[PDB]
Design a protein around this ligand. Structure first.
Ligand SMILES: O=c1ccn([C@@H]2O[C@H](COP(=O)(O)OP(=O)(O)O)[C@@H](O)[C@H]2O)c(=O)[nH]1
Ligand SMILES: O=P(O)(O)OC[C@H]1O[C@H](O)[C@H](O)[C@@H](O)[C@@H]1O
Ligand SMILES: OC[C@H]1O[C@H](O)[C@H](O)[C@@H](O)[C@@H]1O
Lengths: 638, 121, 242
């Protein structure tokens, strides 16, 4: 007789205590909505990071009677039973919006059981475990600790149904354990990628999306030295009451590589902070864009022959994954767009930015002299307009006396003196660049310039930023930061200033980059093999979606060359827009950002847990609803 | 030896073969420039708040003519960006302000740098 | 009565015979302007001091990134001049912000001024509605309020034009075009025209408040008018923006 309505939720992940990847940001942004639903029935569980946990967690005395409510007692008693057997942990408040409750286990305090637990797991599930793989060691240590902790809560809490939700294989070991030991909790597993997915796509030669149905998983996992890891992912997918992925595209991948068709998808939400005035973001775009204009003026000093009032900023940003993030298509397409723009005789310019970290030796001398010379021009101009102001003023205050017959000066000579001209001329000379020197394709000195994938592609297609190129190309091999001496914007600030994000992903389980972009109200190009793109694709009819600034390139059903051409089409369609059209588009794409808020995507998590309880206690569940609903899906339940 | 609190900055301006300014030289000037602008933004805010106090006193609970407490004027948001600017100015442990502003074509053979190294300034 | 914390400053812009702005009005602006410049001086000094601290950290005993004490930044010299400017703004005990910006020709028999006196809105602290009569049309050269009429309207929140005779009324129509909500009556050309295009409930949301001066006794009308104003004051910024 367990309460399905008043239930507990434990959410388990490697990244709870600490930031490794994006998952840390998912559980962080997801917290406010979760705590709103559960309050003190919710606990996140992860391994303790001894180095950092004190910056992020608010340590709490869990022994205190007041630390838990009457109905939460079992959790306290469960921790005491863990403490009883020498298992050290930290219970506290994760210092983030929502302030969820945390249980972090000290894996050193349980490392003793390593030999036995490894032996056990091998016997139960068939999972081998090489000693030099520190991560699966920790994955295992965690798994037995969590199933242990869960088993004990199940013992002492007769009131609530318990939901246990695990993220990624590194947090999946408890799953086969809960199944086999038949612990009275319902379980959910979310995968945010698949191990074989990443690896089969690493080299860039393999035709992933048309061939994965015919891969021998065991053979491949052995080929990559990944067999043990893969076993953990598979056992977690098979053991869980509910199996989920972050996206339809990974769900496809998952069915074939983990041999189980997901029960649904849990797409990543963001915690969107609205402005008091809807148009505020529109003002921010203009401020931020002026900062970029500034950067551009300096970068093109001595070669500035285009109109910024008619210049669009494209960007790609993210980790340096040349094939997987589609940097190759981005550059390829830009080169073809350059051609189309010249043939049509348009006066517009695209300045294309690539923001991807590469080994480098900091900014070039050129980058910094240029900024400084432009600054020096600004300051001189300012001195001069003070002078001009003094002369305009005298004239205006003097009229019509002492010969002044016109109210205003009519001769520039009256306002602009020769000493003024000399210093302006000197500043202009400072900006001149030597004959034949084009603005660089890069802001940094690179460690391995000759072998760099991105730079080689730019050089191969020959986008050298010459006067007649309508598409300019700037590689910035480092993450943006308002401390950057040449382009002093934080990443988010930069995105707001740009016009179009271009993210032609080939392997991308989610798509934080275009989502985040969408949230800043900036249109973007994605692909249908990106999680975000595939999500969007299901939500809006593909022609409609261009109007909300989502452009989706088909990389799944189209030859690579046909994909590049579609990308050029989109970019070209965008450049043809007028300012009015751009503005109104950004408005539409700003309204779309609602659909990426947790207030909406959190409903999916609700669907998943509702499915888990439905599956685990079907008798009691029907008894709540009124009749028997379908349980072969998350969707077929609601 | 005499415990003087004075400092002498000695400049040598003599043309020698070089490859123009160092990255270090240009980066330092840029970072200092960035601190200046941030300080200017903040003092605008500070002005807004001094001015409000001045025009409001003695109403709405104001008991002193001027602010007495910094927190009235300097907000979390302001403190964050100045801290960040200060971090940009920080140099790696044990790194010293250079004895030269340019990259030299032949730094080891240059007579001036040889002397400065020899006397260990 | 409702204990609201909002404040309405109401302006009346209507030409009446006058001898130009009072001395008080001009001194007022000049005094405020002089405070502004002294505040700008002080913050430049503050700037030098914040900057020095920031560039020196953590040398010479500067153990924290920022100054923590106001006295590292605000010097006594600064304090003296700020106080002198604060004293210049001090008005003698009991004296209240004026209800008028000009010296009137016939102050005693002016209709606007007499009504304000009769209803006793004298701009006292406890009054939540403040009143400023400005008996001249607006012009950007006006030394006191350097705005052109169109600009002033843009700056405002609500135009209120409860005409009883108004063949049209550009006054409320101009508000509309400039995105400022307005109150007119159903006996104005403009009001009945809008009445015809939008159903009265919807009309309030599109910033068109229409007071019924045709089928209600004048006192009922005045009340409807107060309802509108109160309902408006109840709005949040977000609501006003929308
Ligand atoms: O200059 C930058 C560029 C990117 N990012 C962030 O780094 C992440 C990079 O995403 P990644 O490529 O690792 O994953 P994906 O974008 O494919 O989801 C994004 O969420 C950005 O917010 C950043 O912080 N600074
Ligand atoms: O950068 P664009 O697409 O040309 O848009 C530029 C526009 O951005 C925002 O809407 C600003 O508020 C406008 O004042 C500006 O005209
Ligand atoms: O038509 C312009 C104007 O004509 C008259 O001056 C009316 O009094 C006024 O209400 C109308 O707007």
């Amino acid at each position: 007789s367990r309460d399905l309505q008043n239930h507990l939720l434990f959410e388990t992940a490697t990244e709870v205590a600490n930031r490794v990847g994006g998952i840390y940001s998912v559980l962080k942004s997801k917290a406010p909505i979760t705590v709103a639903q559960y309050k003190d029935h919710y606990h996140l569980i992860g391994p303790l990071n001894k180095a950092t946990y004190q910056n992020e967690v608010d340590i709490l005395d869990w022994k205190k009677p007041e630390a838990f409510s009457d109905e939460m007692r079992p959790v306290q008693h469960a921790l005491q039973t863990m403490e009883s057997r020498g298992v050290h942990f930290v219970y506290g408040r994760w210092l983030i919006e929502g302030a969820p409750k945390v249980i972090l286990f000290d894996l050193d305090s349980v490392r003793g059981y390593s030999n036995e637990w490894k032996g056990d797991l091998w016997s139960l599930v068939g999972i081998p475990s090489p000693e030099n793989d520190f991560e699966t060691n920790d994955a295992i240590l965690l798994g037995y600790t969590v199933a242990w902790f869960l088993g004990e809560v199940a013992h002492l809490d007769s009131q609530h149904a318990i939901v246990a939700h695990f993220h990624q294989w590194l947090a999946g070991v408890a799953l086969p354990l809960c199944r086999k030991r038949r612990i009275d909790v319902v379980t959910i597993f979310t995968t945010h990628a698949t191990l074989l997915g990443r690896y089969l796509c690493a080299s860039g030669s393999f035709d992933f999306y048309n061939c994965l149905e015919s891969v021998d998983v065991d053979h491949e996992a052995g080929r990559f030295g990944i067999y043990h890891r893969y076993c953990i992912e598979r056992a977690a997918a098979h053991s869980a009451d509910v199996f989920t992925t972050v996206s339809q595209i990974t769900a496809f991948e998952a069915e074939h590589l983990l041999k189980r068709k997901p029960d649904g998808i849990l797409p990543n939400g963001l915690n969107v902070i609205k402005f008091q005035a809807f148009h505020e973001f529109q003002n921010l775009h203009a401020l931020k864009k002026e900062k970029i204009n500034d950067f551009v003026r300096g970068h093109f000093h001595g070669c500035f022959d285009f109109d910024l009032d008619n210049t669009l900023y494209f960007f790609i940003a993210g980790r340096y994954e040349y094939k997987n993030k589609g940097a190759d298509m981005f550059i390829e397409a830009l080169a073809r767009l350059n051609y189309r723009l010249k043939v049509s005789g348009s006066k517009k310019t695209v300045v294309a930015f690539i923001v991807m970290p590469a080994k480098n030796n900091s900014f070039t001398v050129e980058a910094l002299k240029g900024q400084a010379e432009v600054r020096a021009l600004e300051n001189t101009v300012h001195e001069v307009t003070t002078s001009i102001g003094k002369r305009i003023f005298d004239h205006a205050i003097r009229y019509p006396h002492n010969g002044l017959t016109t109210e205003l000066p009519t001769d520039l000579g009256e306002l602009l003196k020769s000493s003024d001209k000399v210093m302006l001329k000197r500043r202009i000379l400072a900006l001149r660049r030597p004959e034949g020197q084009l603005p660089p394709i890069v802001t940094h000195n690179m460690v391995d310039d000759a072998n760099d994938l991105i730079l080689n592609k730019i050089r191969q297609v020959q986008l050298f930023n010459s006067p007649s190129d309508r598409v300019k190309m700037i590689f910035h091999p480092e993450f943006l930061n308002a401390n950057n001496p040449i382009l002093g914007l934080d990443y988010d600030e930069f995105v707001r200033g740009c016009h179009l994000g271009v993210f032609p992903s080939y392997y991308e389980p989610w798509g934080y980059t275009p989502a985040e972009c969408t949230v800043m109200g900036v249109p973007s190009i994605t692909t249908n093999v990106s999680g975000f793109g595939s999500y969007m694709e299901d939500l809006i009819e593909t022609n409609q979606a261009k109007d909300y600034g989502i452009y989706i390139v088909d990389r799944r059903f189209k030859a690579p060359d046909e994909s590049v051409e579609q990308l050029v089409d989109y970019m070209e369609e965008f450049v043809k827009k007028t300012r009015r059209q751009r503005i109104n588009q950004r408005n539409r794409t700003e309204r779309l950002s609602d659909l990426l808020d947790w207030k909406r995507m959190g409903l999916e998590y609700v669907k998943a847990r509702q499915l888990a309880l439905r599956r685990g206690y079907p008798d009691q569940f029907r008894e709540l609803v009124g009749e028997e609903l379908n349980d072969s899906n998350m969707d077929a339940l609601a």
